[PDB]
């Protein structure tokens, strides 16, 4: 769909069987979600944002549905102010910026 930006681009995603709200974030290389229970092995990792670094758990080849569109990729779980969908998953669902 065509999404304008007068409002935050929040969409419903389905991950690990549950529905959650996430922000389509083109300024994010990675996808990071608030703490949650996800099956599978995970590896500790570190990522930084505008205010510093945080510790996250990294889950690979995770299935995620964004507004109906399927994606399978890396998801980082940790202390983020909001669930963010980064370019690693945005490219999988064919999302582009237009103007």
Ligand X SMILES: COc1ccc(S(=O)(=O)N(CC(C)C)C[C@@H](O)[C@H](Cc2ccccc2)NC(=O)O[C@H]2CO[C@H]3OCC[C@H]32)cc1
Binding residues (CB under 8 A) for a copy of itself: these are: 1-6, 8-9, 23-29, 32, 47-54, 67, 69, 80-81, 84, 87, 90-91, 93-99
Catalytic-role residue among 25, 29, 30, 60: 25
Q: Rounded CA gap, 66 and 48, in Å?
A: 24
Q: Rounded CA gap, 19 and 48, in Å?
A: 26
| 44-50 own/partner pairs: CB under 8 Å, 24+ apart | 45/76, 47/76, 47/78
25 is catalytic: yes
Q: Which stretch binds ligand X (CB under 6 A): 14-22, 58-66, 76-84, 91-99?
A: 76-84
* Lookup: tokens for 54: 């945080």
Catalytic residues: 25
Q: Point out which residues bind ligand X (CB under 6 A).
A: 23, 25, 27-30, 32, 47, 49-50, 81-82, 84, 86
């Amino acid at each position: 769909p065509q999404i304008t930006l007068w409002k935050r681009p929040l969409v419903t995603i389905r991950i690990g069987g549950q529905l959650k709200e996430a922000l389509l974030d083109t300024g994010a290389d990675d996808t990071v979600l608030e703490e949650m229970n996800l099956p599978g092995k995970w590896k500790p990792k570190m990522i930084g944002g505008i205010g510093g670094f945080i510790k996250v758990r990294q889950y690979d080849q995770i299935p995620v549905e964004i507004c109906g569109h399927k994606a399978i990729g890396t998801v980082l779980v940790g202390p983020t102010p909001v669930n963010i969908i980064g370019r690693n998953l945005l490219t999988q669902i064919g999302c582009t910026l237009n103007f």
